[PDB]
Symmetry: C6
């Protein structure tokens, strides 16, 4: 997109001290990694899914059973979910600034408190929910070479082999670690606000 500098620049202006660090980690180490590197790693996820069997349709159902939603698609949904609360508030800052000018460090004074605090709180919950889904659905952050499958129409148990499990594990750990960093950064911004008003 050609307007990336426009939106990133706009969000950068309407942010606190820590909040500008957050935009760096979100765009550089989450969007760029997902686009430049991660998406190509998952490009052949079903094509080189290999199952030791002669049963028609067994490969289709075994891949579906073990990867109900792809990792990269899960990360794409997470990025969209944690981007809207930031962009909506940043848009609201412009409207508030627009009213004053019609009469550069962002300060929370009035009703902006209940929007900024909610946006920070929502982003913490959204990241935690996706982190929990990643752990529960994939029983950890390590991809296995071999999966054992017994869903119909596979006879008894069938051995199946995943494409590039180690490279996928490496990028999974990277995305989870960065996401945890974003959670820590967001909690500090709550601590900064929670000691200004209620302390």
């Amino acid at each position: 997109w050609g307007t990336l500098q426009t939106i990133l620049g706009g969000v950068n202006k309407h942010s606190t001290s820590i909040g500008k660090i957050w935009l760096t980690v979100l765009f550089i180490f989450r969007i760029m990694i997902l686009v430049v590197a991660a998406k190509e790693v998952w490009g052949d996820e079903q094509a080189d899914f290999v199952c030791n069997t002669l049963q028609p349709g067994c490969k289709n159902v075994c891949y579906d059973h073990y990867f109900p939603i792809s990792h990269i698609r899960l990360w794409a949904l997470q990025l969209i979910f944690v981007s809207t609360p930031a962009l909506l508030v940043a848009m609201h800052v412009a409207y508030r600034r627009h009213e004053k000018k019609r009469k550069q460090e962002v300060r929370i004074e009035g009703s902006l408190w209940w929007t900024y605090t909610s946006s920070i709180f929502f982003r913490v919950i959204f990241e935690a929910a996706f982190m929990y889904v990643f752990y529960v659905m994939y029983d950890g952050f390590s991809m296995q070479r071999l999966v054992k499958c017994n869903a119909w129409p596979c006879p008894n148990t069938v051995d199946c082999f995943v494409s590039r499990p180690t490279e996928k594990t490496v990028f999974t750990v990277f995305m989870i670690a960065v996401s945890g960093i974003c959670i820590l950064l967001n909690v500090t911004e709550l601590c900064y606000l929670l000691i200004r008003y209620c302390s």
Copy 2:
């Protein structure tokens, strides 16, 4: 597209309070999901359609019978249909504003009533029509692993297996849920108007 900021910004100016929320849901949670994630899920719909048979041409007719229109193609048509009534009115709002200046909250004063009210009414009807088609043509919002097919030239009944049914079910539920939200948002705007004039 590089002019997305131009059109989205332009439509944003010529909108009511709720109408700006509706534009966020349409572009973030419908267009971005369709482009970033959904389209790749359906990329191999016919390629890994697998049928347990030796009959030439049976795979072609069984896939055609069960997927007369792809889900992503249905969503692409729906997005275009529900975007025109909003864009046409927004253009008409600019012309009406253009006339006044030649002599920033949009207010429905005169003939704009019969355009805005019709534009909202059309969007509700278009969204409901596509939701109805999605339900009827696909007997619900869950994709099945196995489809049983007996169209010519398949001998008797043939078992066929769908690619990534669970991933496709997840994105189908997401898209229908968001469209239902858009319908609810549109109905409220009618309620806001229907109590100003006729109440």
Copy 3:
């Protein structure tokens, strides 16, 4: 293209009342439909063309016999043909406007009559010619599941199966219906002009 807003905006300024409606139908429901939906429906037209035979080269000659020119390529040529008469006149209006300023509703006063009237007349003829070719070459607007082929080197008659025929029929009906609407809109603009000058 990034300059789409520029050319569409320029054509929009130099147009009549109905002519602006024609612009939306051409770009929204014909170009966007062809680009974002229709083109990948036809992406695998020859790849999943399946013929029940063991004869080398029979699949090649049977596909060529029944699809001498692809539907989407036929629509690409038609869109280009019906776009030039509109753009050629539009730049001529700019030159005429350029002359007057060197000394915003378009009015047909002088020599613009024989350009605008001809451009409308040419677009009706171009659209009718392509609508006629579509009917004659494909014996109607419905694509069949099975085609029977007896061209050399196929032995006797060979059964062959088309990829996604129902999907292709749906988009064929959509494109023909919209193009027929454009003809009706074009004829009215002739009626508006005809009753002004010769009535």
Copy 4:
């Protein structure tokens, strides 16, 4: 390219009356056809080249023998060759205009005669040379379904079948016809100048 409007607009300003017609035929009916439609017609030229043989390497040498240069690659080279003489002169017109301003219909007065006349003359020769190569190398403008090949290592004569010969023939006739139109338009511009100076 996003700067297409810039270069086309720049070339449009520095041109004669006929020369502006030549710009539309070159870009709309040659570049757009080549990009939008023609290129994907040839996308599978070697992939679905089929030969009735069991000899390894026979398909490779038979395709190479009969298509030493691809049609679309031949058209891409021709378009580049006939675009430079126009762009170089148009750039030279800007420099001449730059000198006068530092002291909108283009007229040839002095040294511009020997540049404009040469540019027109070169484009006629370049187009004729490519049209002659198309005829001589491909023994006409009709692609055949069957080619008979006896180059080593093919045993005796081998039958081979071309992908989409009819669609390729249709676009070949279209490109040659438009190229001949451009030649006719260029000769007229020579006639216009040849009666101004030497008559």
Copy 5:
């Protein structure tokens, strides 16, 4: 990206004498090499990985064992890691310049010392770490034609063959050599600084 000139130009302004040389080596000989040429050298890395065996899943586990992370993915991560410390400081230089103007050779005077010195120091460490990982994981900078694999489920030892090993070795040597040049350039900037303050 269309804003590349914007960011590169901005980084170019806020740099020292040597730091502007480092910008060209990073963008021209590392980013362009990776994008234009290297990436599609690795495009078929697993597709033409060939193993002499009949064992299902042996190709999957042998490729994973010998290429836990792809070379081009390793270079993409390295480029991102060594770009942020330069971009963050260049952003900080703008803020420092912004404060002075609100009251073109960059000079380190105050707190900029501890940011610039750390930014240079981090880049040396990041580059050395990736150069060390490249050597240790791939036992050198030369890719072998044959790899011997005995991981489960391969029986005994299996011979496997890499796609384009000489081609990949050439680009590996090129990328490592340029990174060593960048390390040498960065060390000199430390020497320039370490003799101004502490000498």
Copy 6:
């Protein structure tokens, strides 16, 4: 890239009379040919490399032995190497012009001599080196249909067949011929400078 007009225009301003011709040949007849036509001539180089053998891995090692570096990747490296000395000097010319304005034909007066005379000299050496590598590694500028291969693990000698050798020979001759023209143009600029200073 959208900034191509910006960089090409900027380089065009800061150049001599001949240097502007060399800009045309480099971009139109080398970059455009490489991108538009040549690159996808080589798109299938290894996929349709065919070897008459049953030995696993023989195709991999025979292709690697005869094409250690692809032609298009060799050309991509050469284009980057001969572009940097021109761009670096042109940037230096801007800085020199910046100094004078802060106090349109480029003239070589002072320190610009040792930069310009070296950029020209480097470009001649870089082009000659790549022309030498092309000749030595590929034993000439003609690609052969058949290559005979005996590297391990191929048994005795194996016959292998190249994809589109004639098409590749035609583009190889074109690229070498243009490169030789650029060398001749560069040598003249040395002659122009040589007779000014040392004659």
